[PDB]
Symmetry: C5
Subunit: 310 residues, 5 copies
């Protein structure tokens, strides 16, 4: 039983993030618990302040006509309990609920460990025989406590796109709003545990330049390459199957190379030292002690810049 308007009835929206959590990078989802504030002139139940009762009359959802506000990008039926329904005299209804639903916002891992994200909550609403436009009321949209959590992410700002997008979806215009959660990752735990340790092995790898023992130069370059995989695997796991290239997926791959050519070298510092030509061998090995680290620091300044600087 919808409110007999004379034009498209506006519905005023607003989300108050109460909790944020379980941002699942693999899954590309996160869970939010928050307030949903709605309002509208249903002149149909205006009510003679003085003439009866009091300032504002409290209804149960069965009584009033209420607008169906479905969240767009959610796994399941949004799981909300109702808090208060308070109809003003002029027929103005005041609705508040407290949902908890896991949202399906996408993320851009193009800078992986050093990436900033922009999450989305949605809210369409289909029309019947009056048109429905939704729109935000910014006093119930300052939704974000001073407690918003979201483990391992710094949260930058909860804001929203004022102008809705109105579709025509199956011979009935709907109206969709865009609630925006900006977050930067707390890269860091990534250095002491991945970036650094992954670098350290790479160096030890090429300790085997100042060495002439093939036995201990493979027991060297090779023993480390193994352990690199154990990082490539560690990382490739807590991350999804991107169709593009990660930053750390780059430097983690660019690494693979400086092990191959490391191995190349020790390998040939030998079919060139057993070929009685240690003239050369100890010339090459002497060289790699510079070639490698430089082209690395060079290729990192090349790579690094290729991702952030552009």
């Amino acid at each position: 039983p919808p409110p007999i308007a004379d034009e498209p009835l506006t519905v005023n929206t607003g989300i108050y993030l109460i909790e944020c959590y379980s941002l699942d990078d693999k899954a590309e989802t996160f869970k939010v618990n928050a307030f949903l504030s709605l309002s509208w002139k249903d002149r149909r139940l205006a009510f003679d302040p003085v003439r009866s009762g009091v300032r504002v009359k409290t209804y149960e959802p069965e009584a009033i006509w209420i607008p169906e506000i479905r969240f767009v990008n959610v796994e399941n039926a949004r799981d909300a309990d109702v808090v208060d329904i308070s109809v003003s005299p002029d027929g103005t209804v005041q609705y508040l609920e407290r949902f908890s639903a896991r949202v399906l916002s996408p993320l851009d891992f193009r800078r992986y460990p050093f990436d900033s994200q922009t999450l989305h909550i949605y809210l369409i609403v289909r029309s019947v025989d009056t048109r429905n436009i939704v729109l935000a009321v910014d006093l119930e949209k300052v939704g974000k406590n001073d407690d918003v959590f979201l483990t391992g992410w710094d949260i930058e700002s909860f804001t929203a796109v004022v102008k809705p997008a109105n579709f025509a979806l199956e011979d009935r215009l709907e109206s969709k709003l865009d609630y925006q959660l900006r977050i930067s990752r707390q890269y860091f735990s990534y250095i002491p545990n991945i970036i650094l340790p992954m670098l350290f092995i790479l160096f030890i790898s090429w300790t085997a330049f100042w060495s002439t023992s093939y036995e201990a130069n493979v027991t060297l370059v090779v023993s480390t390459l193994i352990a690199h995989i154990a990082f490539n695997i560690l990382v490739e796991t807590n991350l999804p199957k991107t169709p593009y290239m990660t930053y750390t997926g780059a430097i983690i791959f660019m690494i693979y190379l400086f092990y191959f050519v490391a191995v190349i070298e020790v390998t040939v510092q030998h079919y060139l030292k057993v070929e009685s030509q240690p003239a050369r061998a100890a010339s090459i090995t002497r060289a790699s002690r510079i070639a490698f680290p430089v082209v690395f620091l060079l290729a990192n300044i090349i790579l690094a810049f290729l991702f952030f600087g552009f």
Copy 2:
């Protein structure tokens, strides 16, 4: 209280994918949230446009007779909320819901990392004392936003099989429809992280051809073989127990061999170099430096072609 027809009452269906996600390869399932659009002539509640009310009359599900449309291949009771029920004058009912259920579609890992899939949604409907045929209305079946997600898969097309299949299931014909979601995997993250790294170790493995040290030739071929298993395990994990052979399950197995005979060789470059016959040894070892890589690139072109080319 079903609609007194004069023949098999047609029910018009239609799914609008709103969300796609959590495609579980191990499980052979995926979760979808989407619109379900139904319609039918229940001439029984036709209604004198002019004579009363308005263009179309809105009912609650309790009032009207509504067709039971169960999804066939679903783990649990499909989890749907109703959106709108709008009966036209001629007795034509307009139904719309927004379900979220995890579907059990099978997948063919015969090309694993480079595989395209065709997912299914179903919708039977049992007859009572009128027969029920279901069928698709293609304006509520363009179901797929420009946001359909499905992480790590490119989505090719959401379409459907117009002609239903009508069974006789327990002395009551049912009618089943076939909704088709075509997807190709975003192979790629598979290279920098599996294909390539898995190749690199194989090479270093057989660096130990240009070597005469047994100590460092096993510390070589063997140290890498280990690391191969650590890939075979990595891969065998995020994949199910196929009764057939995978592509990467092939090349990952074909790999096992070039390590065995690598080991064979270094092993015999020794009971043949200690047997004072380095004549031969340094003949064999010299050979494997070609035999191996070739028979590999050969067996890959043989294998690769055996899977894609046929």
Copy 3:
């Protein structure tokens, strides 16, 4: 309000497997979705065909008296929706529901990778002041689509034990039926990934017979034993704590030995080659090159036969 019989009211049962899946070996459970067909003479609501209405009258569950059919071996309250209730003239009721419940059938891993299983569904029913016998109607018991899934198992036959077992449970006879799902495992993925690779290492292990280097004979027999554990671990994991012996638990254990005595040998090919008695050492080592593989192929023919052949 139960049907006033003159003797034990028979209830006619019948299950139509619609879906099978998530057979959990560790858990010893599996999930099934399927039809449950019941029937009984409640002469109490017979109904004058001609005199009123039609052929058969449709009731809702609240109206009729319906027999409580609880599934015996289930984790939780069986999760079923009702499909149709159709009372015949003579007072014969026709009931059909579509449950989805996870069953707790035990399995016998005595042949692990090569094992056939017999799963169970149950259905007791307690008596009140008439006795209740249950029994199967085999036209609603041909329950098994041509789609029954059950990943990684071949399904042999869904059948049922006609003669129920009638208990006396707490001063009230109940009646239990036995629905049987026979399945064989798709052993196979077990070879290319476990059986074979697990064998291959065992062989390389004892390459160190044709070797005199202790350094590379331990770097040999030992480096493989490690990798065996990595299989014993892989397998012991996707399997439960049996109080008896598995097949593969056998050959996986029998394996442990041929590494110990392998190690024994290389170990003594040395305190016997450094003791200037290479007379003996190169006699023993020469021997093991036969002793081992034979006693293995022998102990496998012994073991294998001890499990399947008996």
Copy 4:
């Protein structure tokens, strides 16, 4: 509307285990499905046998006053369906339900792989204005089929503590009962898979006593120590964070030591064999070939006895 007694109304309880399963060692819980039998004199609905109806009158739960019997140690609301309610003439009510709830009983891993447990089910009941004492009726308490499962545990006996404990909990005495499930673990799968394999490596470890190669003595003692961890990890995983010491946690830790001092020795059989004093070295190494295995079998008889013998 509770029964107007003249003293504390006794309620007669009784549990019939139908199923047992998913005993979760990490979680310290297990799931049970079983019958719950209750009874009491509600003289208030006594009923003139001859004067009307029959022997016993069947009620629905809404009609009668029924005692709230909550299970004490359960994760969630016990999940039960009702089976039969049968009021005797003298006002004696006969109640039966069939719940399935996961119980939170603690376990004592002090003898881990060889441990016997005693599980608990509870049943309090709060008083109102008559006091409620609960108590067991041992004919509905022989609850345990000849099918009770509980994978990987032998089940010894389902019994119960006749005398309830009556509390005063918040100005209202409650009454709690103690249902006891005694189980012994099927240790065994623990030997062929853990105990034994974990021993075998320890031996090979100290094959490196009959060796003089440091290269192959570390490639020895060390290669095995790794593999021990892989057991310590395997075990530490399918087990909780005990504040006390396990048996196998002991012997698994006592093991760590015989590797350290093994390493200590090989290590010093060298800074003592390169120090031209092979006099000593080959005296120590000669010794450890007895010292170790003995002090182990000794420290095991010491340890083993310290756990079971006391």
Copy 5:
């Protein structure tokens, strides 16, 4: 229908922990099952003791007006069943429920294995046209059995913040309370399994100071470094992505270094022993046998103190 007060109606709260469990460090949540006790003067249903019925009148929730007490930091709708509602004469209502909900309290891993935590439960309550203040009644707040579990944590005290915090949230003051659960971890299983074993390898690592074999000095320092990662990985897994530094994340990282410079040394005890200057080499190697262990015990006393002592 809320109670016509003359000022802000106080609601008296109180939680009785019945169960605690599944504290998820990664997730930063834990599950609790407990009593929730509420009360308030609804003078509106005062009731003439003598004049009718008895001492106190029992209602069902539909009858009375009951305050909506939502838990603040919870994943989902708190899952509670009602136990008793008992209105006193003066209009004083007595409410009791038994909820089971998983709470989202944060944790501070800054001392990881040796850390004490303070968990939170919340309970807001929104006002309508009377204001609502909540507040604790400490006789239903002694909530904690002598059975509170919480595996692997010692539980210190369940207490609560008497003075609520009253917000203005969306033109309606709410009132929030703070229930505090203090727990210390049972560090320990962390030693025999992590701390110790992680140390032991580090030592063996630098056995390779009393060695001159490069072959067995890399087969030494390197073989252990690998095994360290296998701890860094073990630990990094059962812990979340902190934006700060852990204790064990420190010492686990500080460890990485003493392997690098260990490797540095053995590496240079060689390009300095092959450079015919064993003068120096056996001077350095001689040194590291003190430098290392000291700077470690020093850097641990430095580190350890940097975390606990400050």
